[PDB]
């Protein structure tokens with residue numbers, strides 16, 4: 356009844372161009388079986404949204420990667436938030452929510468905005484820059500580690516550790532094996548910065564440790580909640596801002612619209628998150644036998660959700676393959692959906708908005724003037740290099 360497919364969603368050819376295979380996955384049926392990894396797959400918006408919003412059936416505590424924590428050891432201690440289910444997930448969630456609160460965004464918005472304007476000004480003095488290393492990487496590296504309260508030394512470990520985490524979600528292919536192989540120094544740095552003495556006052560990390568007396572989390576839970584922000588707080592933002600520049604570079608009509616109205620900067624970033632989906636895929640594990648789209652899925656089965664495919668499903672989106680900065684983007688699953696929907700999305704959207712705002716006000720043109728290089732990762736979509744020439748406004 357369920358179609359079986361040999362498509363490997365974690366192969367280099369798939370990363371290089373996932374969109375044809377994703378239509379094949381969507382049109383084959385609401386639920387597919389991927390013989391390559393012995394998992395169920397859902398690529399349409401409706402089923403992906405349903406799975407995300409049924410955490411009791413499709414749990415996260417047995418792992419959101421291919422590996423079933425009931426069968427294998429996790430490569431690192433489980434995240435108290437990403438790899439946890441209600442009720443154990445609830446209170447660590449509320450703490451990270453209050454740490455990354457609207458009140459916290461108001462305190463850091465000016466500094467994030469000025470750093471974005473200063474970076475775009477610095478890049479316009481060079482002209483021909485690499486939009487990944489000199490922009491998508493440089494700007495979040497200039498605001499987020501300081502906002503965490505991180506020390507200067509060892510920041511070179513932050514992006515490698517994040518790429519390691521995203522790769523460890525994948526199957527045991529060479530990407531995952533090699534990442535875990537080179538992991539030990541990145542782990543040691545990250546875990547050490549999670550301790551309370553190493554987090555400067557006022558920052559996100561010190562605020563997490565300060566939330567350990569309210570009855571929501573204990574002091575021994577604080578280091579791993581800090582680890583969550585050090586795992587997730589940089590890499591997806593880099594790929595997201597890199598996606599927006601990429602989109603604005605390929606669609607000059609939208610850049611001209613964004614210049615004419617800079618208030619579109621926030622939705623311009625949101626549409627880039629839908630269009631490129633920095634987080635392509637995630638797993639769930641069935642806790643019971645369940646019926647999903649006419650398919651009966653037994654207990655203990657891994658279910659792979661194609662978030663990026665769900666954000667391009669024509670059953671849900673009009674002209675899904677077009678970058679439209681005025682699109683009604685509400686409902687896209689680039690940040691997830693339901694109880695696990697990104698708790699740090701206010702930080703990502705703030706960085707993305709103030710960056711596109713700076714580009715909208717200071718840049719006249721963004722032209723690709725060099726070979727574009729893709730970054731391959733088991734979970735994330737993003738570029739390794741984006742050579743652009745920036746024309747000042």
Ligand code: HEM
Nearest residue numbers: 436437587588591592595689690691695697698699702703
């Ligand atoms: C463009 C930027 C980002 C994207 C596309 C993104 C994507 C996602 C997605 C899809 C999820 C859902 C995972 C799931 O359902 O299993 C998630 C959760 C999460 N994100 Fe983000 N994220 C971004 C930025 C951030 C930032 C800036 C932070 C922290 C400062 C962060 C921290 C987290 C955490 C802790 C979770 C787990 C929440 C939970 O399990 O309840 N993310 N993210």
Ligand SMILES: CC(C)(C)c1ccc(C(=O)O)cc1
Nearest residue numbers: 434436437582583586587591
């Ligand atoms: C941004 C993604 C979804 C990849 C993420 C979220 C949370 C964690 C964690 O460590 O809790 C790690 C990664």
Ligand SMILES: [Cl-]
Nearest residue numbers: 431542545546
């Ligand atoms: Cl680790």
